[PDB]
Amino acid sequence: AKSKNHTTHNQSRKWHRNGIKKPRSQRYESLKGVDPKFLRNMRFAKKHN
Amino acid sequence: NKASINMLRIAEPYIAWGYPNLKSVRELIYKRGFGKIKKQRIALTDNSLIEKTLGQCGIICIEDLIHEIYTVGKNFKAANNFLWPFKLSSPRGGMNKKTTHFVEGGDAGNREDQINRLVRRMN
Amino acid sequence: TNTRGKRRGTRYMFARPFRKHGPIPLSTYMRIYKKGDIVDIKGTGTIQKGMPHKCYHGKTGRVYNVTQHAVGIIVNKQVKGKILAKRINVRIEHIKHSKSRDSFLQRVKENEKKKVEAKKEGTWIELKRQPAAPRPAHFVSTKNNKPQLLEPIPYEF
Amino acid sequence: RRPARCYRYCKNKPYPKSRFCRGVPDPKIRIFDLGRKKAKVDEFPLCAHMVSDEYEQLSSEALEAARICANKYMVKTCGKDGFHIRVRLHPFHVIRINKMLGMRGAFGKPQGTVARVHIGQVIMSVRTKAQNKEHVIEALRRAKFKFPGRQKIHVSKKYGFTKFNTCDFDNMLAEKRLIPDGCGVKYIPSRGPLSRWKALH
Amino acid sequence: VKVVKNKSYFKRYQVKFRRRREGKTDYFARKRLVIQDKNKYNTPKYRMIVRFSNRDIVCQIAYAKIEGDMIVCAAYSHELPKYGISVGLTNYAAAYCTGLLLARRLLNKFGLDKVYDGQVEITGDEFNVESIDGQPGAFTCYLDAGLARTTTGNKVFGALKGAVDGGLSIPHSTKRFPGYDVESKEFNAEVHRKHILGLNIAEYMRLLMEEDEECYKKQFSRFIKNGVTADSMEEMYKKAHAAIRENPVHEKKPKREVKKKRWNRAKLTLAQRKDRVAQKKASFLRAQ
Amino acid sequence: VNVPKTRRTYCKKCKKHQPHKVTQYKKGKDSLYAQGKRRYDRKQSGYGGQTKPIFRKKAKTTKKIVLRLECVEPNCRSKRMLAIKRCKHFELGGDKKRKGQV
RNA sequence: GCUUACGGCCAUACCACCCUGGAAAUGCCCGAUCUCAUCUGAACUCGGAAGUAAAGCAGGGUCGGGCCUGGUUAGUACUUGGAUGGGAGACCGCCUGGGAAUACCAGGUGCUGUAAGCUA
RNA sequence: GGCGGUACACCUGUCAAACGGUAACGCAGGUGUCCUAAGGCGAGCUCAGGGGGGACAGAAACCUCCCGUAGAGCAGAAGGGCAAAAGCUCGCUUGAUCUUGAUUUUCAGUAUGAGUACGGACCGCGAAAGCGGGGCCUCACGAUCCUUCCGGCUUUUGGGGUUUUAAGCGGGAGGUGUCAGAAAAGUUACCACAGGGAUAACUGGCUUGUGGCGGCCAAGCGUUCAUAGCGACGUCGCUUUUUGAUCCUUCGAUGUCGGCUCUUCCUAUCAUUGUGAAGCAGAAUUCACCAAGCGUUGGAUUGUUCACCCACUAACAGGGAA
RNA sequence: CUCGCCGAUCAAGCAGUUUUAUCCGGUAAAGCCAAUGACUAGAGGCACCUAUUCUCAAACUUUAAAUGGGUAAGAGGCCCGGCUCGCUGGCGCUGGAGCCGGGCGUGGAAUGCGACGCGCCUAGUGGGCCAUUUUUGGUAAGCAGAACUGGUGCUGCGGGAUGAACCGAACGCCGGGUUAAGGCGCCCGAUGCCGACGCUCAUCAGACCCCAUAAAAGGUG
Ligand SMILES: [Mg+2]
Ligand SMILES: [Mg+2]
Ligand SMILES: [Mg+2]
Ligand SMILES: [Mg+2]
Ligand SMILES: [Mg+2]
Ligand SMILES: [Mg+2]
Ligand SMILES: [Mg+2]
Ligand SMILES: [Mg+2]
Ligand SMILES: [Mg+2]
Ligand SMILES: [Mg+2]
Ligand SMILES: [Mg+2]
Ligand SMILES: [Mg+2]
Ligand SMILES: [Mg+2]
Ligand SMILES: [Mg+2]
Ligand SMILES: [Mg+2]
Ligand SMILES: [Mg+2]
Ligand SMILES: [Mg+2]
Ligand SMILES: [Mg+2]
Ligand SMILES: [Mg+2]
Ligand SMILES: [Mg+2]
Ligand SMILES: [Mg+2]
Ligand SMILES: [Mg+2]
Ligand SMILES: [Mg+2]
Ligand SMILES: [Mg+2]
Ligand SMILES: [Mg+2]
Ligand SMILES: [Mg+2]
Ligand SMILES: [Mg+2]
Ligand SMILES: [Mg+2]
Ligand SMILES: [Mg+2]
Ligand SMILES: [Mg+2]
Ligand SMILES: [Mg+2]
Ligand SMILES: [Mg+2]
Ligand SMILES: [Mg+2]
Ligand SMILES: [Mg+2]
Ligand SMILES: [Zn+2]
């Protein structure tokens, strides 16, 4: 009772059904992952101007 | 242009294009002439419809619409996109072969000046 | 089923060109990558530290973070049917500046000077690229180049 | 063994005898050059080939049979020292044989070597004197019946087993551009050290 | 015997870098020395280059760039005759002066000659200049030994001591200065002051002159004609250090105009090259 | 795999690098009044048989070694568990390697 | 033009052999007291200046090998897309676009940045 | 299906069709370890091999010169990388330590595992720049509950207080290899049930390796003479009276081996009719052609189809029709 | 539901597409006289050694396509001034980043389109099958397993006599006109053309995608 193992036949038709949307590039990108030494000083450049 | 010619080459098996003369451009806008007023296929039965939509481009009648398309001007995109795609009929007299290229006896591909013959049988 | 190793199929992409082995030339180490510039990604088998994944070799992203030895890049990777912005840490030996935007910046600087030159002179030079137009009408002279008769050659085996 | 109808078309990627494919039996053909092989270039000017017209693969047993068929006819009509046969197809593709019979683990063991030929690739080449043209064409014609497919017997325009035409070979000898070395010649260009040019003169 | 240098050898042959083939640059140590961190954004990373020839000492300050590193300031050992030292332009004492000459000349063009004057007196102790608040920071560079083996007492560290005494803030330790007893792991600064002022040179001039005057004339020939004795060593270098701190600036020589007269023969053109082999062929056919 | 009996590692209580005594960690005998044991005996009491799974199919051969880093400070006798990779042979004393030997 | 220091690109720079050159500089060279250093002052480190071109180095030479570039190989090999094209088949031709590689032939052989000095 | 194997958790090259991904009980392999150094750092050195030499000394001991792009080595499989390195040797060492988050990879973009770049401590090596939070990179590993140990600048043990005990928070370990993790030996022909043509045992179908049958070429056999009669080495086909391969039809059922009986068809013709060929004198026999009209037996043994023998005969030909 | 609706009165943004610009790769081919591995034959110099030669690689490669993958084509820009910082440091700008103000539309490639915009709930499905090309195991299979796209499953219609998938074409109910693929002796709508040229005789003629079989070898037809 063997079956079919793997297939990517109808997948490309399902992807472009609702379209392949690029990630929404928003103005003012986030600041997660930046150097903690750089962010610690940048928060000191905002509470003194 | 080189941007649009390569779009026609990549879709050759499905199209049959050429170089229309004045009479083809003239008869297609008079007989099959339907304008896109507000996303609607309105028939060009009066110059008031053209002047209302294409009045800024200087096109105020159906003859300016023909001159702007035959002699491609600075306002060809606004004039061409204003015209709904011409609903042509079946070619009276039949086609040679819809599958193969025009050079090899078929009908698809690019026919330089023979597209006028195909218009008179489809228009 | 294939193995899910991190360096499966990277026999040729992470290799080095012929007669280009040895130490990394010291110009790739003294290139400054600011925050917000377009950089390419091209892994190198010499530096086994911070090398990108094979799904990024040949891609291109923008920089969002700069560290001592590496650079944080925002690369768009399509997984199945969605494109996701990936934040990866790649050392500066596997990346280089992308010249994809240098043709745009040079075109802007030439546009900012063409309009100020036309404004102080009173012309109407158009600042916009156009596709290759059909060739204009021209005369072909046959004064010293007469048409040479060509014809197919017989078959020889 | 299994008939040649089963291993006629080039269906698989080339599977040569190497570190990964071990246990291949020895090919049927082991000798590729016959006749007076140690003859100079000016002794056998004529050259005739057996060009293939089908993209197929010729078994090692067919190359052995057609070699002996063409050799036995040349030794009776031109003598044992009046020709030089050079089989230009080496059996390198190892065909496989499944186990003697379900198909659980169907990958088979090696059966033999088979030479893959292309359209226009020479199978055999025979050089001889200029008056033995009617004997070589007949000798190579009888060898086609040992091969599957379609072959052509073409008399080449080159000078023997060399790659230079007959109309240019005599001129390149007087200009000292070709020097005979065994069954072939050496192309001596005009871009070396001058010491070897003075040795020729 | 099989040939090792054939066509297959040179086709697969990859040459080293030019500075590596000449044996001048160590690229394994250069990468860890001139490359600046990526979060510095074109912050120049300076370094003191100390090189020794058979007759001269070169001390330079540079910072790496893509098109080649720029030399900020350079002080040579042949400029010491201008300050008094006319003999022994390659010893340890002359190395301390060209490092001091490089330190005072650098601080002059940067407007840092009033601050960070260093140790005016030579004590030999470990001295590291301190950055005073309110004033511009001290110049911080690094030592570049190159291919010279850094052993205890190398003259590379003589210019290092001359620079840190001029005002340069170079990180180092007294383990490689002459006078560091590795057995007790203590640095005897009094021994270092002797090598700085050439006192070890004077004891050699006395050990020879009091044993055999013949060898003294061969070892110190130019020391006799220039009028310098074993008792005029310490004072000569002291007054030399004073002249260096007064006028360290070096003016360039007047550009002497030359007609650019070539002294080497030019390459043979394609005409002269083909004509030469045409004559050898014709001359070869006549002889036979 | 042998490790030395002394380590100059970081002491969390001293907040400074201090010499340590290395010792292999042993589990120690189970307490009869732990919460899991006090409810296992009550659940298994009476009739019903075995009520908890008894692991049978063992697969691992060796286990990870845990070092007991105890600071040699007289006042700071702070321990700490440090784990090493799996190894079938582990000796704490051992003898240092000698290259130039027959 | 040259000699050095630090380099960038990393053979148009490499390799073999031959010839020529020392104004400055460089190199060889002369010593082992100090610093340092090894079985050995060869190397490394240090002290020095009697000799000046043997080698390093530099510049030339070779119908040089290599490398680099171009021509050619060739619109060939291969390939995108198309047909109710051919053929028992293997495979091939054509339509619409892109389009290589070796051999062979020819030319070239380091360029250049910062700093210092010398007009062989 | 069972037996075997693990393709069940992982790694290298290939398959894979020049981004990535991509299957089969595809191919060649590897793993459940090893290492206080084979970890970290600094310095010096140059390897594999080949040539000329040098008491014993030889093809292999050791000394030394020359060439030597790495053709050696780097714990292991393979691939990649590496020459003042990442290899070799040496002396100092414990960054194989303590911490929060971000992030890559398998991915659902979850956990774990394995990695990357930083921040904050405390340190190692180095003159220094720097390098190092394990092994040059890709592999070498494990949830909840429970136990156990370590840590607190700490909590509860409750109507208060003190001391044991127990519970809890934070981090390791004990392990689930069916490797996202049940605690588990068979037999049933005395067998039952829900189902399955998702799946075997019949026919049929596709396929023809195998079986059977027929050509092509001509070394040779045939006293001589390749082809009267044969056809080695090769090679091209047909057939479904062999046996496989496959699993499309049939498991709310297609009655299943042989014989008996009876009808019909096929020809790849054993005999008879009409002929051609010979190594056809006659007789006998062999090869081939038109040709299936007609006939092709009685018996011993075996359940046997298939065999073997006894006699007869013009001959006692071979098959199909579930 | 948030908008655009008024079209480039507007900012736009988007795309299974091209163009321009800049990167990525190691497949086809090619090469082995270049490395690793396999391999035939002579020749020269005193078994090796040098220069040649025949033939190959899927787990080899100097070189290297076609197709293809990523990114960039503007106001979220460009330029200028000031300020802030404990980060950085010869160098109050030395870098860097943040903040504030001002100057500048010829929206600065083609084509198309309202944004397939922002969320919520969510059934069914998780046995697929076929074809062109690429491709693995197998002698082969209406066989087994993959890749791109299409079809089918879920789909009728014209054509292939017949038919799941082939070719044409996708469907509300009808009148007229005209075609596709395929056809026009008769069945059977249409050559009932004074169609053009040539080939072909078969005592098994031949008659056209998938497709329903035919080869080697022969002929003084
Ligand atoms: Mg399934
Ligand atoms: Mg399955
Ligand atoms: Mg589907
Ligand atoms: Mg089609
Ligand atoms: Mg694999
Ligand atoms: Mg050719
Ligand atoms: Mg009890
Ligand atoms: Mg001389
Ligand atoms: Mg040359
Ligand atoms: Mg070229
Ligand atoms: Mg296994
Ligand atoms: Mg691909
Ligand atoms: Mg740290
Ligand atoms: Mg069949
Ligand atoms: Mg058979
Ligand atoms: Mg005979
Ligand atoms: Mg016969
Ligand atoms: Mg046979
Ligand atoms: Mg049978
Ligand atoms: Mg079935
Ligand atoms: Mg018959
Ligand atoms: Mg016969
Ligand atoms: Mg905008
Ligand atoms: Mg499932
Ligand atoms: Mg579901
Ligand atoms: Mg079917
Ligand atoms: Mg299938
Ligand atoms: Mg199936
Ligand atoms: Mg559908
Ligand atoms: Mg039909
Ligand atoms: Mg109708
Ligand atoms: Mg019909
Ligand atoms: Mg015949
Ligand atoms: Mg005739
Ligand atoms: Zn402690």
What does this structure look like?
The structure is cut from a larger assembly and holds chains A (49 residues), B (123 residues), C (157 residues), D (201 residues), E (288 residues) and F (102 residues). With 123 residues, chain B is of the alpha+beta class. Chain B contains six helices and four strands; from the N terminus they run H-E-H-E-E-H-H-H-E-H. The longest helix of chain B is centred in the first third of the chain and has 9 residues, at 22-30. Chain C has 157 residues and is of the alpha+beta class. In chain C, 11% of the residues lie in helices and 20% in strands. In chain C, a hairpin with a 4-residue loop joins strand 3 and strand 4 (83-91). The longest helix of chain C is centred in the C-terminal third of the chain and has 18 residues, at 102-119. The two termini of chain C are 50 Å apart. Chain D contains four helices and nine strands; from the N terminus they run E-E-H-E-E-E-E-H-E-H-E-E-H. In chain D, strand 8 (178-181) and strand 9 (184-187) form a beta hairpin. Chain D is globular and about 75 Å long. At the C-E interface, loops of C face helix 3 of E. Chain E binds three RNA strands through helix 1, helix 2, helix 3, strand 1 and strand 2. Chain F: It comes from Danio rerio. Chain F: Its main location: cytoplasm. Chain F: This is Large ribosomal subunit protein eL42. Chain F: Belongs to the eukaryotic ribosomal protein eL42 family.
Major sheet of chain E: order of its strands? 3-2-1-4
Outline of chain E: extended
Give the helix proportion of chain E (percent range): 25-40%
Cα-to-Cα separation, first versus last residue of chain D:
60 Å
Termini separation of chain E (Å)? 36 Å
Summarize the largest interface: chains and residue counts: C-E, 21 and 20 residues
Bound molecules: magnesium ion, zinc ion
PDB class: ribosome
Keywords: translation, embryo, zebrafish, Dap1b, Habp4, Eif5a, Eef2b, ribosome
Entry title: Cryo-EM structure of the 1 hpf zebrafish embryo 80S ribosome
Chain A: 60S ribosomal protein L29
What is this structure's SSE topology?
This is part of a larger assembly, with chains A (49 residues), B (123 residues), C (157 residues), D (201 residues), E (288 residues) and F (102 residues).
Chain A: H1 11-15, H2 36-42
Chain C: E1 38-41, E2 60-66, E3 70-78, E4 83-91, E5 95-97, H1 102-119
Antiparallel strand pairs in C: 1-2, 1-5, 2-3, 3-4
Chain F: E1 6-11, E2 16-21, H1 35-44, E3 64-68, E4 70-71, E5 81-86
The structure holds three RNA strands.
PDB class: ribosome
Keywords: translation, embryo, zebrafish, maternal, Dap1, Dap1b, Habp4, Eif5a, Eef2b, ribosome
Entry title: Cryo-EM structure of the 1 hpf zebrafish embryo 80S ribosome
